Design an enzyme around this catalytic site. Structure first.
Site, PDB file in Angstrom:
ATOM      1  CB  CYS A   1      55.541  69.130  42.085  1.00 40.26           C
ATOM      2  SG  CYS A   1      56.173  67.857  43.228  1.00 40.26           S
TER       3      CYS A   1
ATOM      4  CG  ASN B   1      51.085  63.657  28.651  1.00 42.13           C
ATOM      5  OD1 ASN B   1      50.244  64.561  28.758  1.00 42.13           O
ATOM      6  ND2 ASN B   1      51.070  62.794  27.639  1.00 42.13           N
TER       7      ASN B   1
ATOM      8  CG  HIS C   1      53.857  66.341  32.897  1.00 43.21           C
ATOM      9  ND1 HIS C   1      54.890  67.242  33.101  1.00 43.21           N
ATOM     10  CD2 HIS C   1      53.959  65.832  31.647  1.00 43.21           C
ATOM     11  CE1 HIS C   1      55.594  67.241  31.978  1.00 43.21           C
ATOM     12  NE2 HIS C   1      55.073  66.405  31.075  1.00 43.21           N
TER      13      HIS C   1
END
Ligand SMILES: CN(C)S(=O)(=O)c1cn[nH]c1
Ligand SMILES: CN(C)S(=O)(=O)c1cn[nH]c1
Lengths: 262, 265
Positions: free
Chosen positions: A221, A184, A186
């Site tokens: 982050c 995804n 991330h």
């Protein structure tokens, strides 16, 4: 891999790979953490999940890790077979917990254990919310109803303070590459473990083995973010850790590690 | 995993993991490259190496990768089973070659292929040397003697000459540093990290709309644990081609050069 007989837990075996080991020819904590994620993902798949339930997808809700705690007694060697058993438990309206037990397939002894606390949040606003009854009856049918703790006693519930400047040690300018991202886009949680460990001096890594790691996840982050990793000795050797944005110093994670002499 | 019937090649099956895939839910080129290394390592172990021979360990000699070439037709999906067959061949006194063939376990079709050229080097001085008879006779018993090429074609991409990228680069990613997870059991930077670093300077839009079909990398110098690298890319071209260069962030010393070929999804 497969669900156990009662369908309330899941086991999988892994053979430790050549690129998965460090200088001691044993699996690193990041390889162990990756294996914990893999077995968790296989468990969610086996019981029909995405692990978003049917009501979660309509409401754009997701489970996110708030805290992760790993304790390793023996790291498996390159070529060794490790067996991992995982299960989930509801923690009322607070959230959910996923636990793991690591065993040497040959001896049957417990070589490690882990626990993680998950909270529900809206995917888009990133706002936390309590566990609804509708989004609880759907996942409780896949959980044991009596308590089943990997850490019954303990270090997994300890409060972690915020490291104060100046840090004893630091590694700055850490940036994620594409391999640090998941399907995804991330940042993978295992990358934060690597970044935390980067500020431990090499001499400690060469003479000690990591026995315990506890991480509290505060903020994600992004792909274009830059992180500073900070470590101070608080003591075996114990350290207090902090990851923050390189610029404004916004906190992303805090944690503690405990190391034993080889 | 196991050696084949003739004992001249080795096969192993892998189930693609959740953390091993990208946005398309298929294995990344770095996961494929890791699997190629793993099956190569298992082959050397199965035939008694640890891949230094007995004469090599006596003279402090090691095999080092000079060039790596990968071509992928289909990337396996998360949960899919991929079967990889690998083997080695002597290239006379020049060095050795390790080849691989990737197949979908369910359909049996070839989904990828790779080739790599290895040279002998003294571990300490880093000086190259031609393969002697003593070493050659020790590893030739584990290799097929007739030619067996993963890339047989007379004008294939695996043997192409790669030029040096000239400044200014079209794209760049600066300040790349290896972390402890990028190192192997001997504290050297893993070759798969150089693949990741090369790919970092490809724009995100190209990665989002294209699939990587071919990658060729020439290894010139090793990046130490405390080194910092710059990744440089220039478009050289339905398909897109790039010229690549990794160099030290400071003095600009070359570590790698390569080429990639991408096809529209
Ligand atoms: C083991 N950790 C890296 S974690 O608890 O953050 C986790 C487990 N599955 N997904 C994330
Ligand atoms: C596939 N590549 C990453 S490689 O050819 O450099 C290699 C293969 N085994 N060890 C290195």
């Amino acid at each position: 891999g497969s669900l156990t007989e009662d369908g309330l837990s899941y086991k999988e075996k892994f053979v430790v790979r050549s690129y998965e080991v460090g200088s001691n020819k044993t699996a690193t904590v990041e390889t162990i953490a990756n294996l914990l994620q893999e077995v968790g993902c296989n468990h969610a798949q086996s019981v029909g999940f995405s692990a978003t339930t049917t009501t979660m997808r309509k409401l754009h809700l997701i489970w996110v890790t708030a805290r992760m705690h790993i304790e390793i007694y023996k790291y498996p060697a390159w070529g060794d077979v490790v067996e991992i058993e995982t299960w989930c438990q509801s923690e009322g309206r607070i959230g959910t917990r996923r636990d793991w037990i690591l065993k040497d397939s040959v001896t049957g002894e417990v070589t490690g254990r882990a626990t993680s606390k998950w909270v529900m949040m809206n995917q888009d606003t990133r706002r936390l919310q309590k566990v609804s009854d509708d989004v609880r009856d759907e996942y409780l049918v896949f959980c044991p109803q009596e308590p089943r703790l990997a850490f019954p006693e303990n270090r997994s519930l300890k409060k972690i303070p915020k490291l104060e400047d100046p840090a004893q040690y630091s590694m700055i300018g850490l940036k994620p590459r594409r391999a640090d991202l998941d399907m995804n886009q991330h940042v993978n949680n295992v990358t934060y473990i690597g970044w935390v460990l980067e500020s431990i001096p090499q001499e400690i890594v060469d003479t000690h083995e990591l026995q315990v790691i506890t991480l509290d996840y505060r903020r994600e982050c992004q792909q274009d973010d830059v992180v500073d990793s900070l470590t101070t000795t608080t003591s075996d050797s114990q350290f207090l850790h902090l990851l923050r944005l390189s610029g404004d110093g916004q906190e992303i994670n805090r944690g503690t590690t405990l190391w034993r002499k080889k």
